[PDB]
Amino acid sequence: NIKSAKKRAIQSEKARKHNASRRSMMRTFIKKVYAAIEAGDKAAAQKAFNEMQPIVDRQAAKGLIHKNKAARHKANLTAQINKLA
């Protein structure tokens, strides 16, 4: 480039790699919960929900997503699993 905003380019790329890693992991756990919910096993879905919950809340804490987004995931999943029986 021109200035040393190239340093920020490197940092943004590295942070994108990391954030894509963590967002993919988180979305995969939620895919698991959704596959359970469309499978109907309220207990398997419950285990999956308790498996994703610390992941998504830890990510919200990290800032990868927002508190509101994590809470929205948890609320949607609780509603689903409760109507799931």
Partner RNA sequence: AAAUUGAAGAGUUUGAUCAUGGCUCAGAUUGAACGCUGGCGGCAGGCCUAACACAUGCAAGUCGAACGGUAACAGGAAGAAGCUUGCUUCUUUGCUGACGAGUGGCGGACGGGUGAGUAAUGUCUGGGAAACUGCCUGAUGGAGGGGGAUAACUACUGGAAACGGUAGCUAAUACCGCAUAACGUCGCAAGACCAAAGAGGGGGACCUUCGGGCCUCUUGCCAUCGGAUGUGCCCAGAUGGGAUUAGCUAGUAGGUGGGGUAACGGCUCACCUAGGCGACGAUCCCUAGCUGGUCUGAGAGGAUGACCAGCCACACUGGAACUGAGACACGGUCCAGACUCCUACGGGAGGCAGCAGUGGGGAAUAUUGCACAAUGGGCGCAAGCCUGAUGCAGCCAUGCCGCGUGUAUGAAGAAGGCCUUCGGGUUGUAAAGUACUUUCAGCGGGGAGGAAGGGAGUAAAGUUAAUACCUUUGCUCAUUGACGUUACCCGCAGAAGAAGCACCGGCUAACUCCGUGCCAGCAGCCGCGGUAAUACGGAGGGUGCAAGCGUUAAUCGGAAUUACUGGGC
Which chain residues interact with RNA by CB under 7 A? 1-16, 18-20, 22, 30, 50, 53-54, 57-58, 61-80
Q: Which residues contact 45 (CB under 8 A, 6 or more apart)?
A: 33, 36, 37, 39, 80, 81, 84
Compute the least distance from the CB of residue 79 to RNA, in Å. 6
Residue 64: how many CA atoms within 13 Å on its side-chain side?
20
Please, which residue, 6 or 35, has the CB nearer to RNA? 6
Minimum distance, C-beta of residue 5 to RNA, in the bound complex (Å): 3
> Minimum CB separation from RNA for residue 30, in Å?
7
Residue type, 52: M
